[PDB]
């Protein structure tokens, strides 16, 4: 068990990897034309980082 | 995304009281075996 959750994760998080996951922290800008890119444009890995 | 729990008492503990009843069982046997 121990391994599988240690192996799950992507070792290294890419474009895809951060939104399915709680664990790791993702953060901009306050609308420093990062977000504003994410709420609209709607991707929905980008969908759910914005969220 | 928190699963890196190990195997505490609560977690396993009656492994300890199994074996104990398999060792009071043994003894119990023994002493009679004497007879």
């Known amino acids: 068990a121990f391994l599988t959750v240690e192996r799950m994760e992507s070792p290294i998080d890419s474009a895809d990897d951060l939104a399915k996951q709680t664990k790791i922290e993702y953060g901009a800008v306050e609308d420093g034309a990062t977000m504003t890119f994410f709420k609209k444009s709607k991707i929905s890995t980008y969908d759910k980082m914005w969220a | 995304s928190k699963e890196a729990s190990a195997l505490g008492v609560q977690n ?24």
């Open chain 2, 12 to 35: 396993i503990g009656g492994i300890f009281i199994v074996l104990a009843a398999g060792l009071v069982l043994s003894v119990f046997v023994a002493v009679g075996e004497f007879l």
